[PDB]
Design a protein around this ligand. Sequence first.
Ligand SMILES: *[C@@H]1O[C@H](CO)[C@@H](O[C@@H]2O[C@H](CO)[C@@H](O[C@@H]3O[C@H](CO[C@@H]4O[C@H](CO)[C@@H](O)[C@H](O)[C@@H]4O)[C@@H](O)[C@H](O[C@@H]4O[C@H](CO)[C@@H](O)[C@H](O)[C@@H]4O)[C@@H]3O)[C@H](O)[C@H]2NC(C)=O)[C@H](O)[C@H]1NC(C)=O
Ligand SMILES: *[C@@H]1O[C@H](CO)[C@@H](O[C@@H]2O[C@H](CO)[C@@H](O)[C@H](O)[C@H]2NC(C)=O)[C@H](O)[C@H]1NC(C)=O
Lengths: 48, 49
Amino acid sequence: DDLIVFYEYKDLGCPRLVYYDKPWKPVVELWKNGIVEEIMNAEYVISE
Amino acid sequence: DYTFNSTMEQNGCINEAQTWDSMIEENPDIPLDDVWGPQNYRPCFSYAI
Ligand SMILES: *[C@@H]1O[C@H](CO)[C@@H](O[C@@H]2O[C@H](CO)[C@@H](O[C@@H]3O[C@H](CO[C@@H]4O[C@H](CO)[C@@H](O)[C@H](O)[C@@H]4O)[C@@H](O)[C@H](O[C@@H]4O[C@H](CO)[C@@H](O)[C@H](O)[C@@H]4O)[C@@H]3O)[C@H](O)[C@H]2NC(C)=O)[C@H](O)[C@H]1NC(C)=O
Ligand SMILES: *[C@@H]1O[C@H](CO)[C@@H](O[C@@H]2O[C@H](CO)[C@@H](O)[C@H](O)[C@H]2NC(C)=O)[C@H](O)[C@H]1NC(C)=O
């Protein structure tokens, strides 16, 4: 109904931007000790 | 009347830093010696402070 959402800049940061009716999948990277090491290529899911 | 070489970006401040004018405005009456120092350093490459 009158549901409301409270955005948190400090936890999240500047949110991504995507557009209407475009096929998109996110790109995810694996970090070890604060260093970019490899893009993640395994099966993953997203949710709300 | 004295300025510097670069800006807040082009050095890497992700978030709002601490500058001389804001620190002076922060401390009202105390001499300049106790206004800004290593007991009051907050880094700017921060994202969370
Ligand atoms: C002399 O003064 C200069 C500035 O004038 C200092 O230079 C900077 O020093 C920083 C500390 O060593 C360097 O650290 C950067 O910090 C960033 C922190 O961001 C993190 O982000 C994650 C999320 O991803 C958060 O969880 C964390 O909490 C942090 O918020 C890093 O992102 C950054 O990594 C890269 O930096 C390069 C710099 O070219 C960027 O191109 C890149 O996009 C990415 O941001 C880095 O770790 C900082 O790099 C450095 N800047 C420069 C221009 O050199 C010197 O450290 C001072 N001298 C001494 C001896 O301290
Ligand atoms: C700030 O001004 C100085 C001028 O002193 C610029 O320093 C130059 O930096 C480049 C980069 O390596 C050097 O190759 C030059 O030799 C430097 N010049 C001098 C005279 O030392 C610096 O680029 C300026 N910074 C910004 C952000 O504009």
